[PDB]
Symmetry: D2
Subunit: 106 residues, 4 copies
């Protein structure tokens, strides 16, 4: 039920091999690792979970590493997306000094 | 080779039944109708063309009609995307007073 | 009452010296005003009395901007089309955020 | 040298009274400054000497903003994390453009 999709606004392409880490917020307010992976050649990451109970989740997209691998100076350390779970696609559109993120919930 | 995908940033969903018109620029600088359709339940419009020679194209996405059908006051008349053809996905992310458009060319 | 602001999402900077042409629908597009963005990425003083109700088009010459930086971008231009002043005079800021294969545009109306 | 600007993409307006909390990485997140956006959608005067090199997090409380307008938005907050002043002092504008299920954030560094 959770998928992440990442596009590169500079090249006009999927953002491939972007590392993504998902965390779930614990009772003591810390972030517990939940799942992770890297985007495919289509910029997508499937199969993160099945387990996906209500709670607050954080999806961290490693944008800095991506721009570094392209030789382009980036601004952000990463893009964080934090939401309460209540099909979820977390989309992100990446530029070096800007990004957007959209939840497509169907 | 040309596909249009539209998302609704207010609802977090595909933008369904959005009218899209494609034009090709003529030798006298006018816009000639080329193809059109409406987005599907997945917010996508396929099968616009096959015919898709080099030239300047305009994709008009009827955002105002979409927001009107939702009872939400919009700013723009439409979103226009103009490019030279040289697989093209024209993506758009819609809010009432803002939109983005991204070309995913693969 | 009409201002255009352009930012470069690759550099995190104002987009300087971007040409901007404004048209007003008469059903033809009549030239209305033009200018280029300053060092702040802004273009002021496009109009005044003159900015009556109508459908306006703001064409931002993003391709020339990118080409001058060595980049072959996707779009020919960014066009922003809108009805203005339909409920009396307003101040309009048309913002654009540019990347080689993507742009966003936002209207701030006060 | 740090300013936060927030806009509402549904209304085409400044996002007014949005809470903003800034942290600096010590590996814990230490509270650094906080405030709320004004009628212009801006928050100034967060820092000064004080804004040394470091990793900073700007947390923008978008959910409370939307909830006060009757909306149940997707995100808990918008978080913007960045290294600052790594090559000497700069002016940073952190902009955010909010929709109920989507946001964009941009850095303008001068």
């Amino acid at each position: 039920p959770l998928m992440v999709k990442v596009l590169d606004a500079v090249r006009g392409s999927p953002a491939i091999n972007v590392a993504v880490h998902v965390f779930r917020k614990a009772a003591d307010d810390t972030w517990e690792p939940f799942a992770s992976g890297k985007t495919s050649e289509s910029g997508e990451l499937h199969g993160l979970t099945t387990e996906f109970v209500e709670g607050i989740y954080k999806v961290e997209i490693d944008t800095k590493s991506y721009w570094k691998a392209l030789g382009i100076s980036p601004f952000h350390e990463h893009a964080e997306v934090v939401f309460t779970a209540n099909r979820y696609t977390i989309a992100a559109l990446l530029s070096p000094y800007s990004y957007s993120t959209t939840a497509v919930v169907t």
